Design a binder for this molecule. Structure first.
Ligand SMILES: COCCN1CCN(c2nc(SCCc3ccc(OC)c(OC)c3)c(C#N)c3c2COC(C)(C)C3)CC1
Lengths: 1033, 46
């Protein structure tokens, strides 16, 4: 019935163009971002309780929001972590495939299932449910160059001007801002408050009075009096708009009168809303903003617009303000597009340079110049109807698609020139006859090569999210190949062709080929004593098949089983970890050195040392700094020594020389949606309720068990911070009432002077900013500064905190990390240089099952998706190939042919198990995608062999000998015509060490030796089973 | 526009060289694919 469509010529020329013109729109409708939405949908409930503790920030805030979490809709884990800055990050991560849009809805239908079980200050402080797919877009830093602007001067300028203009640049669906805006920080001065007999109660009370916007109303308001002609709208006290207009905030009656100024007791100034973050970019103060790209993930035209939007703001910048981009996606995206669209077009030209080895013609050879881009632009087109973004995973879903479009078109070409170049008859003799022998085969060529990708397109997890970006891309590469092979190929293999003489395979044509076009077949005629010499006595040649399998079975479990490689992402985060209770001054003092380290020792590589003090991935506070150390292009970073893993090893080694801090220096994971670090993320459970010491000391038994294997487990470290000293102040509460003070004069004094307290809003350049009272810094540093705070009694006399409040010191863990209502302690760690996570995570599983029941081990984050790959990814081969084990019986009409063609499969499995370890690469996800590319290549050639053997017994009547002297001797030539196309499609990748093509050449060399097994081995092993299994069955 | 001049001179040398190492495989080891001569047929079921 596709043969009925052959004799309509221009029907077939241009339906190829239909799939291209729709694909010509697919340029104008595909979002492009190199890592799409592949994370499990997580939700970060970012609370706040400023100045507060950590032992009872989980109890005011977190244990309330944790205790509404009744049966979370398609949940995997809810981890939260309160800390010493009063920050809570409840992280509800859900099942993959569950709608992230309903998630942020349903989290605030789990939180806002049962809100006012909240002590209601939980939401009164300001909580922010957010779909924190913790991938970013560009993480634009904004620095001052000369030094006039401080940090906080920048961070307000960004949030007053940039953020509201960047958060509606298209593609941006989230602007996170760093760190915060200005806020009229009211630094109180307790040796001025005692001078006026005030407390911070009456400092706050006047600011909630005189700085209050009052709905006055209207002259001539509604309803009027009969006889009205005047309408106004009364301005009462506005929100007070400046530092000086808080300066004259009144406190009392003043018969001292220069009316009692709030600027006589409180040093008014602007400043940030928290100072836990000091971001010194190259030792120079900076704000930042972390952009997160919306669904509609078009990272090009967003960043093509954002880098324009910054250039619109460069006229608006004050003195010395500079924009630098520490992290990005696009210089890791842009050249990976424009090469792998050109390489893709080069592979189109390489396919023409395949048949410059085979055809050496113009009009008969111009067929895949049209036939290849139709499968390509249609793969853009159908995925644009199925919602799959241009990324790695569908540009590498198109380079792997090159091997699936050459199996149809170019295979017809020598089957057509089986009649011309080998027999000398017109192409009409090859138009219907040669297609008619394979029209029933392209039923199965389309069948068995889409069949092995069926279960991965439906399986869940991020492993399933990687697969669905691969599988339906190859399926669209398959389904728009058989729908092109049965249309476009016959009208180009019957109409515009050239008559060629008989016996001429290019002998008198351009030198080196003519001596070789015999000599390949002539060595194949010396290989005829291997064609026949294998197939006669097949007894010894069956134990040779186990030699293929013993090499498979031994070099697969010994092959290291990682999950994702370390991508050279152009940045690497260096985190700092001071003693428990070390200040923001000292952590900055180390990030003086580390920036001086990365700008004297590695200035040839390092772009920049955007160094956020205080904040840290895996842990906040003041003892923990981090540096987003960024790199250059690979053209400026040559060789193995200037990749990340060589830099961070030089970093960490010279950081052991750096006193005062365990300064790790690690790399981001491959996909940035999941991990703080790469490697793994060893969580921990409160199984029985062991408390806090043995909670910590089985974790110290863990580093007694897991850090003492230093060869494999490199830098196994905790996340939950060591028990810092906490400063208990025993408000000797009866003295704190017998002296005359009400304790609300005390807890407001003790907790809005030391604390930092929101008061109200104010107006600043027409923008709402917060009003914070706090002590001035030199009056809250020490336990001595307890004694300087004065509280007012009943009778107006002033009492010091040292008169009653007996201070002391205690333990306290700031990062009280929880898990679904269970306290926990997270543990990080990488794997060995040259080894993998699976020989490190299961090594941890040797060292996590050591503990008794009572404190359990959990594997989630990056560690869930590899715990899910360990449960389905080699188990993918079962239900994939058993459908292929049942596809053959439909094609070959026997139970016993699936005993044969299902044993072409481990020929190329060992083809890739060699090419990995011959360069030293691991069993990641892509290696298996290389295997499913390789297994596709093995079964592809068998249909040109074994379905042809089905075809011979009807149309030419051949046993084994006459079959093999015509099947194998002649139909091995089109197998080369796919071999030189696809496997040389990674020829620009063999010499490429840039945008993470390392484990992608183990695919290409793996299919090459898999083609070597297709070159000698696979063209016998079903005819080996013609002399044994067809002898048996 | 330079890598199409690369793939003029480096896709005219790395197409026959990959065609040449397989000749060191399929003709060099193809002779050792015929050094093995014998029968070991596992016809124990038959
Ligand atoms: C409170 O912070 C929570 C957000 N975390 C995730 C994103 N992370 C990241 N932030 C930045 S830039 C941070 C801008 C900034 C400015 C002022 C600050 O002081 C107020 C400040 O401290 C936070 C940060 C970068 C980069 N480049 C990266 C990450 C993370 O890794 C990348 C590779 C994306 C590079 C910052 C930490």
């Amino acid at each position: 019935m596709p043969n009925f469509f052959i004799d309509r010529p221009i029907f077939a020329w241009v339906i190829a163009i239909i799939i291209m013109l729709a694909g010509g729109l697919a340029i104008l409708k595909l979002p492009v971002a190199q890592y799409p939405t592949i994370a499990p949908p997580a939700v970060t409930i970012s609370a706040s309780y400023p100045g507060a503790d950590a032992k009872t920030v989980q109890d005011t805030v977190t244990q309330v929001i944790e205790q509404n979490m009744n049966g979370i809709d398609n949940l995997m884990y809810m981890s939260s972590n309160s800390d010493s800055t009063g920050t809570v990050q409840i992280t509800l991560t859900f099942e993959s495939g569950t709608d992230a849009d309903i998630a942020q809805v349903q989290v605030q239908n789990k939180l806002q299932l049962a809100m006012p079980l909240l002590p209601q200050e939980v939401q009164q402080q300001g909580v922010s449910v957010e779909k924190s797919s913790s991938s970013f877009l560009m993480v634009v830093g904004v620095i001052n160059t000369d030094g006039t602007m401080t940090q906080e001067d920048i961070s307000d300028y960004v949030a007053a001007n940039m953020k509201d203009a960047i958060s509606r640049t298209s593609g941006v669906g989230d602007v996170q801002l760093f760190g915060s805006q200005y806020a009229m920080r009211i630094w109180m001065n307790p040796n001025e408050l005692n001078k006026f007999q005030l407390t911070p109660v009456d400092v706050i009370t006047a600011i909630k009075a005189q700085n209050a916007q009052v709905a006055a109303g209207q002259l001539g308001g509604t309803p009027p009096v009969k006889g009205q002609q005047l309408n106004a709208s009364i301005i009462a006290q506005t929100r007070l708009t400046s530092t000086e207009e808080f300066g004259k905030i009144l406190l009392k009656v003043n018969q001292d009168g220069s009316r009692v100024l709030l600027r006589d007791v409180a040093k008014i100034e602007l400043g940030g809303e928290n100072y836990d973050i000091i971001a010194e970019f190259n030792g120079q103060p900076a704000s930042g903003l972390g952009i997160k790209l919306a669904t509609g993930a078009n990272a090009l035209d967003t960043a093509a617009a954002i880098r324009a939007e910054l250039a619109k703001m460069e006229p608006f910048f004050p003195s010395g303000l500079k924009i630098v981009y520490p992290y990005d996606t696009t210089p890791f995206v842009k050249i990976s597009i424009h090469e792998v669209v050109k390489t893709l077009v080069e592979a189109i030209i390489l396919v023409f340079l395949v048949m410059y080895l085979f055809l050496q013609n113009f009009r008969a050879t111009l067929i895949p110049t049209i036939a290849v881009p139709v499968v390509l632009l249609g793969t853009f087109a159908v995925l644009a109807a199925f919602g799959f973004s241009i990324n790695t995973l569908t540009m590498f879903g198109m380079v792997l698609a090159i091997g699936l479009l050459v199996d149809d078109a170019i295979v017809v070409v020598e089957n057509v020139e089986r009649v011309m170049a080998e027999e000398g008859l017109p192409p009409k003799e090859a138009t219907r006859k040669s297609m008619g022998q394979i029209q029933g085969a392209l039923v199965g060529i389309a069948m068995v090569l889409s069949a092995v990708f069926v279960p991965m397109a439906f399986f869940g997890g991020s492993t399933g999210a990687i697969y669905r970006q691969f599988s339906i891309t190859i399926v669209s590469a398959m389904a728009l190949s058989v729908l092109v092979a049965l249309i476009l190929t016959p009208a180009l293999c019957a109409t515009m062709l050239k008559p060629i003489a008989k016996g001429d395979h290019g002998e008198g044509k351009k030198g080196f080929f003519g001596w070789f076009n015999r000599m390949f077949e002539k060595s194949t005629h010396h290989y005829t004593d291997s064609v026949g010499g294998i197939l006669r006595s097949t007894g010894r040649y069956l134990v040779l098949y186990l030699i293929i399998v013993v090499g498979m079975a031994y070099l697969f479990v010994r092959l290291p089983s990682s999950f994702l490689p370390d991508e050279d992402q152009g940045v690497f985060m260096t985190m700092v970890q001071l003693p428990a209770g070390a200040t923001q001054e000292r952590t900055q003092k180390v990030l003086n050195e580390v920036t001086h380290y990365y700008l004297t020792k590695e200035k040839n590589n390092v772009e920049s040392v955007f160094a956020v003090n205080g904040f840290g991935f895996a842990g906040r506070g003041q003892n923990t700094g981090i540096a987003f150390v960024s790199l250059k292009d690979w053209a400026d970073r040559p060789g193995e020594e200037n990749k990340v893993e060589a830099i961070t090893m030089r970093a960490t080694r010279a950081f052991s020389q750096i006193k005062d801090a365990m300064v790790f220096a690690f790399n981001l994971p491959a996909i940035v949606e999941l991990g703080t670090a790469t490697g793994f993320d060893f969580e921990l459970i409160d199984q029985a309720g062991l408390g806090h010491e043995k909670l910590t000391q089985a974790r110290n038994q863990l580093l007694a068990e897991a850090a003492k294997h230093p060869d494999m487990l490199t830098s196994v470290r905790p996340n939950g911070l060591e028990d810092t000293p906490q400063f208990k102040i025993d408000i000797d509460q009866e003295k704190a009432q017998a002296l005359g003070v009400s304790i609300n004069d005390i807890n407001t004094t003790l907790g809005a002077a030391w604390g930092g307290s929101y008061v109200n809003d104010f107006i600043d350049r027409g923008r709402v900013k917060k009003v914070y009272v706090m002590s001035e810094a030199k009056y809250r540093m020490l336990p001595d500064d307890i004694g300087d705070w004065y509280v007012r009694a009943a009778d107006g006399q002033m009492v010091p905190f040292s008169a009653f409040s007996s201070s002391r010191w205690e333990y306290g863990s700031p990062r009280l990390e929880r898990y679904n209502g269970l306290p926990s302690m997270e543990i990080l760690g990488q794997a060995a240089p040259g080894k993998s996570t699976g020989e490190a995570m299961e090594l941890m599983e040797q060292l996590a099952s050591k503990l008794p029941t009572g404190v359990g081990y959990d594997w989630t984050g990056m560690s869930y998706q590899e715990r899910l790959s360990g449960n389905q990814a080699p188990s993918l081969y079962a239900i994939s190939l058993i459908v292929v084990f049942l596809c053959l019986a439909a094609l070959y009409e026997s139970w016993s042919i699936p005993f044969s063609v299902m044993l072409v499969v481990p020929l190329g499995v060992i083809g890739a198990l060699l090419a990995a370890t011959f360069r030293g690469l691991t069993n990641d996800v892509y290696f298996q995608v290389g295997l499913l590319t390789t297994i596709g290549l093995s079964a592809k050639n068998a249909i040109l062999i074994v379905e042809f053997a089905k075809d011979l017994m009807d149309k030419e009547g051949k046993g084994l000998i006459e079959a093999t002297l015509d099947a194998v001797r002649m139909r091995l030539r089109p197998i080369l015509m796919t071999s030189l196309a696809f496997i040389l499609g990674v020829m620009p990748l063999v010499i490429s060490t840039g945008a993470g093509s390392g484990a992608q050449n183990a695919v290409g060399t793996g299919v090459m030796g898999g083609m070597v097994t297709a070159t000698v081995l696979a063209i016998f092993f079903v005819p080996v089973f013609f002399v044994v299994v067809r002898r048996r069955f | 526009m330079l890598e199409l001049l690369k793939s003029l001179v480096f896709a005219v040398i790395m197409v026959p060289v990959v065609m040449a190492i397989i000749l060191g495989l399929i003709y060099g080891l193809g002779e050792v694919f015929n050094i093995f001569s014998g029968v070991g047929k596992k016809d124990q079921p038959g």
